[PDB]
Amino acid sequence: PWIMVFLVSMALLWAIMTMVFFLYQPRSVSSAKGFSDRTVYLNWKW
Amino acid sequence: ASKRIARSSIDWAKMAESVPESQKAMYNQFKAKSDGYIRKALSYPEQPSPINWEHYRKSLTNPAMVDAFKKQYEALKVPYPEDKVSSQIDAQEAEAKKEITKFIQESRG
């Protein structure tokens, strides 16, 4: 049954591929230190 | 007099509490250049030396010239100089008010 073995093995290898694809830890370490310098004071007239 | 020349100024203490140094380094000029207009204000009074007409009456045989010069000095009064920068400063003030209103609105947002 080499044809069914080939099809089941490749379907399982693709299933393992899409299991690993969603195996990640989303690290929300987006620091907001840029806003400490984004604000600019109003320029005067000289 | 010497009121609005010798014995008056603007409070610089609240001025230095906002300026972000390198952003407003012209304040270092503004505190200094206006100080030049204070330095010449150390000089230049209204009457720098009153004229002792009695001394010239005693030192001259004919005091009629002294009385004539005293009358001419009293008959001449210099008024305050003309100004044409007031409207320019008012226009700059109005533009500053509009920009401050816009900046306050952006700060509120």
Q: Dig out the tokens for A12 from the structure.
A: 């399982």
Elucidation technique: cryo-EM
Q: What burial class does residue A3 get, using C-beta atoms within 10 Å of its C-beta: 0-12 exposed, 13-18 middle, 19+ buried? A: exposed
Contact (CB<8Å) A42/B99: yes
Interatomic CA distance for residues B77 and A20, integer angstroms: 98
Residue from B17, B23, B106 whose CB has the most chain A CBs within 10 Å, to mutate: B23
Interatomic CA distance for residues B35 and B69, integer angstroms: 37
Q: Would an 8 Å CB–CB cutoff place A42 in contact with chain B?
A: yes
Interatomic CA distance for residues B53 and B71, integer angstroms: 11
Q: Would an 8 Å CB–CB cutoff place A46 in contact with chain B?
A: yes
Interatomic CA distance for residues A16 and B92, integer angstroms: 71
